[PDB]
């Protein structure tokens, strides 16, 4: 009897259902309920959509109303492990059945039901679909505005509901958001509509189970469009204007001064939007997120206030430290007034060593990914510091192997001075293009060249017999190291080509030599020159951003280097909006555009300018 | 731009050559499952592929199984 009424709702029969229901009612409550997954017959027909689904749903609801049991019928959850809270309303909203969802809601459906199943909360984003574990969140994420508006105005809907992840509807809309290519802008429209309908700040100030607001979650997840909307959110109506983050102080002609809120944006509230945008690394759209209105301006003013002098001081101190290290190492005996130089070398090497040590100890293993584009200089500065430390450590005792570490420290220190080229723009582009080139195609060329060099070196060294008596300079390709050195000298264009070696097969020796000449000088090196042209072509446009990312990292690191005092150099003013208490911060930005030509109503101050 | 394909052509050639190198046994590593369609006999093989797209927004009628996932 159960299988007959369960297999008939899928096909959508309007006349067989009543006949199968009258005898079922007269047989006798645990009748129309599956015993494995709890799939009730009401929601059983929702997945199989037929033109007669609405009719049989109405008959099922009427039969439930006529036998005085409706609470257990329409508020029936699942039982499986993968589905712990899926109901009739969830699957009806997903099937784009607004009329069926309205009929279920008007009959007493569980609006605040949580679909906390394992399928609903995926871990690999391939076997599941996360929407917020709420029918309202599902309607918002599936571009169903009519269902959302039908759900907000209700007597028991909880907009501020938090699922098992701590997320809310705004958090879920942030997570499911994407760029314009993959999906449309409906998420931003849904975010705006739900936030305006709620009319409160508790939705955007609620932290999930990660210590993140939806604004901070949008900054962390890489959602540049949602962050752009929230950061520059201006609301024209006066009934709810405290929900805005940007306020137009005045607008005189094509010149407008806007105030940007900096509550959790400026790096003064632990986890801020600027710090999250800059320091995190597991995103690809990091460059376009820093181009927004408040973040760019804040980075500019920070650089023009304290980061410029700090970077110049660090450059000068490292340059003087390298100069005096070079002077005291090259002018070794092989000095009371000259003792200050070596003492300063030791002190500054220890300072760099401890600074890099504490900067490596808390360094994440996520920024160590990609190809050393954000932590390589930390390692080389630490290596140079410990090289100087070990050099003086072996110099204090009677260790002859102390000059090697000192000379390596000089070479690395003068190589590490190219880090400071990021202060200027053009040298910054040059440095990051050095980075991409030396990791992309210099390494491949080195790998292939070393394979050819060692193979041909060991092939040529085997074609020469031993030298006769009273003779040692018979052939330059004597051993394997000698043949490798000769091929390396030939590659760089040094020396003289001698073919009269002590080879028993001089023709094969010349053939292998010419083959090496072609493969390296004609093919490998010239193709390398051709390849790094393509590299500098691609990174030609991808250089005004990555350099600015490095600059932003240096600005934030320099600001973190400041103590608890001396950091009282906040952005701009205190007055931000019309709120009578807690004006927080603001950031004046002036914009010029000659295309709108509209009457200014959202203006705040009648008198423009200061 | 004509390097992400030719290399994959060489990779596919090596994959097929390596599979042909396998003996009559040890080749029992077929793609995925047996159940493919509603046909009562000779279900043959199948290959589960998951796709994500946020542009259709249509009611699913050609679906086969009511319970998603495993
Ligand atoms: C297109 C071409 C350009 C170059 C391409 C690459 C070419 C590379 C090819 C190089 C081979 C060149 C000849 C090797 C020497 C042979 C003779 C010799 O002295 O043998 C010595 C071995 O010699 C070595 O091991 C040398 C040191 C390492 C060589 C590789 C450095 C790579 C640096 C990369 C840095 C990172 C990358 C840089 C950028 C980030 C043996 O010792 P000896 O001295 O004979 O005496 C023994 C000592 N004893 C007596 C105390 C016991
Ligand atoms: C290997 C590749 C090294 C270069 C590289 O990674 O690029 C560097 C740039 O490059 C430069 O601007 C030059 C670096 C100095 C010379 C590099 C060769 C080593 C010489 C050795 C001579 C013999 C000594 C041998 C000692 C063992 C790294 O730049 P980046 O990734 O843009 O910096 C980001 C890191 N940060 C955010 C923490 C600041
Ligand atoms: C997660 C990170 C947190 C770090 C917290 C550390 C503790 C903080 C507490 C205390 C440390 C206080 C400063 C220590 C200075 C010695 C350190 C040193 O070697 O020079 C530092 C320079 O730093 C300066 O230029 C010093 C500025 C001191 C403050 C005065 C500012 C005045 C601005 C007046 C304006 C009007 C380091 O320089 P760098 O550019 O970092 O070095 C580059 C190499 N790297 C890229 C590999 C790093
Ligand atoms: C010169 C070579 C010597 C030998 C080096 C050998 C080793 C080679 C290694 C490196 C050399 C090449 C790179 C050098 C980078 C360090 C300087 C720097 O960062 O300047 C910067 C800060 O510095 C100032 O302008 C200082 C301002 C006053 C500070 C007062 C402190 C007290 C200049 O910044 P900017 O981007 O010009 O300023 C932006 C504003 N603008 C665009 C309107 C101008
Ligand atoms: C000591 C030096 C060793 C340092 C090892 C660092 C590895 C860096 C790899 C790297 O830059 O990848 C490059 C490839 O690079 C290759 O294909 C490398 C092949 C092996 C050669 C390694 C150096 C040999 C030096 C002589 C022995 C970049 O390749 P891509 O196509 O741009 O890869 C895209 C993804 N990626 C940009 C995130 C990498
Ligand atoms: C970076 C890592 C890569 C490369 C680093 C170098 C790898 C090999 C190291 C050998 C060094 C050595 O001591 O050789 C010795 C012999 O050894 C040989 O003759 C070895 C021959 C096979 C290996 C090299 C050729 C093929 C490499 C294929 C490419 C490999 C992978 C490349 C990846 C880019 C030196 O012999 P000798 O100079 O005659 O000594 C004189 C004394 N005697 C006459 C008494 C013997
Ligand atoms: C492969 C088959 C064997 C090759 C070696 C032939 C023998 C040889 O050593 O001859 C030559 C190398 O040999 C060449 O002339 C090689 C030329 C390049 C071979 C690959 C071409 C592509 C050198 O031989 P030889 O000792 O200088 O004189 C040969 C004596 N005979 C001509 C009287 C025979």
Curated annotation (Swiss-Prot), chain A:
Subunit architecture: Homotetramer. May convert from a homotetramer to a homopentamer to allow pore dilation. Interacts with TRPV1; may form a heteromeric channel with TRPV1. Interacts with SNX11; this interaction promotes TRPV3 trafficking from the cell membrane to lysosome for degradation.
Q: What is an annotated GO biological process for this record, any one?
A: response to temperature stimulus
Ranges of the Extracellular topological domain? 396-400, 464-475, 502-504
Tissue-specific expression = Abundantly expressed in CNS. Widely expressed at low levels. Detected in dorsal root ganglion (at protein level). Expressed in the keratinocyte layers of the outer root sheath and, to lesser extent, to the matrix of the hair follicles (at protein level).
Query: Which windows of the sequence hold ANK repeats?
Result: 1-28, 40-68, 84-113, 131-161, 168-200, 210-232, 268-290
Q: Which UniProt keywords apply?
A: ANK repeat, Calcium, Calcium channel, Calcium transport, Cell membrane, Cytoplasm, Disease variant, Ion channel, Ion transport, Lysosome, Membrane, Metal-binding, Palmoplantar keratoderma, Repeat, Sodium, Transmembrane, Transmembrane helix, Transport
Report the outcome of residue 418 to A: Impairs channel activation by tetrahydrocannabivarin
Q: Where in the cell is it found?
A: Cell membrane; Cytoplasm; Lysosome
* Binding site residues for Na(+): 493
Transmembrane spans: 301-330, 335-363, 375-395, 401-421, 425-463, 505-541
Protein name from the UniProt record: Transient receptor potential cation channel subfamily V member 3
Report the protein's function.
Non-selective calcium permeant cation channel. It is activated by innocuous (warm) temperatures and shows an increased response at noxious temperatures greater than 39 degrees Celsius. Activation exhibits an outward rectification. The channel pore can dilate to provide permeability to larger cations. May associate with TRPV1 and may modulate its activity. Is a negative regulator of hair growth and cycling: TRPV3-coupled signaling suppresses keratinocyte proliferation in hair follicles and induces apoptosis and premature hair follicle regression (catagen).
Q: How is its activity regulated?
A: Activated by cannabinoid that binds to the vanilloid binding pocket. Diphenylboronic anhydride induces pore dilation and enhances cation permeability by promoting the conversion to a homopentamer.
What gene name does this entry carry? TRPV3
Its UniProt entry gives the catalysed reaction(s) as: Ca(2+)(in) = Ca(2+)(out); Mg(2+)(in) = Mg(2+)(out); Na(+)(in) = Na(+)(out); K(+)(in) = K(+)(out)
Q: Name one GO molecular function term.
A: metal ion binding
Give the CC-aspect GO terms: cilium; cytoplasm; lysosome; plasma membrane; receptor complex
Entry's disease: Olmsted syndrome 1: An autosomal dominant, rare congenital disorder characterized by bilateral mutilating palmoplantar keratoderma and periorificial keratotic plaques with severe itching at all lesions. Diffuse alopecia, constriction of digits, and onychodystrophy have also been reported. Infections and squamous cell carcinomas can arise on the keratotic areas. The digital constriction may progress to autoamputation of fingers and toes. Palmoplantar keratoderma, non-epidermolytic, focal 2: A dermatological disorder characterized by non-epidermolytic, abnormal thickening of the skin on the palms and soles. Focal palmoplantar keratoderma consists of localized areas of hyperkeratosis located mainly on pressure points and sites of recurrent friction.
The record's similarity note reads: Belongs to the transient receptor (TC 1.A.4) family. TrpV subfamily. TRPV3 sub-subfamily.
Q: How does it sit in the membrane?
A: Multi-pass membrane protein
Show intramembrane residue spans.
Answer: 476-501
The residues exposed to the Cytoplasmic compartment are: 1-300, 364-374, 422-424, 542-610
* Keyword Cell membrane assigned: yes
């Amino acid at each position: 009897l159960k299988k007959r009424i369960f297999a008939a709702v899928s096909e959508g029969c309007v006349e067989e259902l009543v006949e199968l229901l009258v005898e079922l009612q007269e047989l006798c409550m645990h009748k129309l309920t599956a015993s494995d997954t709890g799939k009730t017959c009401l929601m059983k027909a929702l997945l199989n959509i037929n033109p007669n689904t609405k009719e049989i749903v109405r008959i099922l609801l009427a039969f439930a109303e006529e036998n005085d049991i409706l609470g257990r019928f329409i508020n029936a959850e699942y039982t499986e492990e993968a589905y712990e809270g899926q109901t009739a309303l969830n699957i009806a909203i997903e099937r784009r059945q607004g009329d069926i969802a309205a009929l279920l809601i008007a009959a007493g459906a569980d609006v605040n039901a949580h679909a906390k199943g394992a399928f609903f909360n995926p871990k690999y984003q391939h076997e599941g679909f996360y929407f917020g574990e709420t029918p309202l969140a599902l309607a918002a994420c599936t571009n169903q505005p009519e269902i959302v508006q039908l759900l907000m105005e209700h007597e028991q809907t909880d907009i501020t509901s938090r699922d098992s992840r701590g997320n809310n509807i705004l958090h879920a809309l942030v997570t499911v958001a994407e760029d314009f290519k993959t999906q449309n802008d409906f998420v931003k429209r849904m975010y705006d509509m739900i936030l305006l309908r709620s009319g409160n700040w508790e939705l955007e100030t609620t932290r999930n189970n990660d210590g993140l607001t939806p604004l901070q979650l949008a900054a962390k997840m890489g959602k540049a469009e949602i962050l752009k909307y929230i950061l520059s959110r201006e609301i024209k109506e006066k009934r709810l204007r405290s929900l805005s983050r940007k306020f137009t102080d005045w607008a005189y002609g094509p010149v407008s001064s806007s105030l940007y809120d900096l509550t959790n944006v400026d790096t003064t509230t632990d986890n801020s939007v600027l710090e999250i945008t800059v320091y995190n690394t597991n995103i690809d759209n990091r460059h376009e997120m820093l181009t927004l209105e408040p973040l760019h301006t804040l980075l500019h003013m920070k650089w023009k206030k304290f980061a410029k002098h700090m970077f110049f001081l660090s450059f000068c101190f490292y340059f003087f430290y390298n100069i005096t290290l070079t002077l005291v190492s090259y002018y070794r005996p092989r000095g009371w007034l000259q003792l200050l130089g070596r003492m300063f070398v030791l002190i500054w090497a220890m300072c760099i060593s401890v600074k890099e040590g504490i900067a490596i100890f808390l360094l994440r293993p996520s920024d160590l990914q990609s190809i050393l584009s954000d932590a390589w200089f930390h390692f080389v500065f630490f290596i140079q510091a410990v090289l100087v430390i070990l050099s003086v450590f072996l110099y204090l005792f009677a260790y002859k192997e102390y000059l090697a570490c000192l000379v390596l420290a000089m070479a690395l220190g003068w190589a590490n001075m190219l880090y400071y080229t990021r202060g200027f723009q053009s040298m910054g582009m040059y440095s990051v293009m050095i980075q991409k080139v030396i990791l992309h195609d210099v390494l491949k060329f080195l790998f292939v060249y070393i394979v050819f060099l060692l193979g041909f070196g060991v092939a040529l060294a085997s074609l020469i017999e031993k030298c006769p008596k009273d003779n040692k300079d018979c052939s330059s390709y004597g051993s394997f190291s000698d043949a490798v050195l000769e091929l390396f000298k030939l590659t760089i264009g040094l020396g003289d080509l001698n073919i009269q070696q002590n080879s028993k097969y001089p023709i094969l020796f010349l053939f292998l030599l010419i083959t090496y000449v072609i493969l390296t000088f004609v093919l490998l090196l010239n193709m390398l020159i051709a390849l790094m042209g393509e590299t500098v072509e691609n990174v030609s446009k991808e250089s005004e951003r990555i350099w600015r990312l490095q600059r932003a990292r240096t600005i934030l690191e320099f600001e973190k280097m400041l103590p608890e005092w001396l950091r009282s150099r906040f952005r701009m003013g205190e007055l931000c909006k019309v709120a009578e208490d807690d004006f927080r911060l603001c950031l004046r930005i002036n914009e010029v555009k000659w295309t709108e030509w509209k009457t200014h109503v959202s203006f705040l101050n009648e008198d423009p300018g200061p």
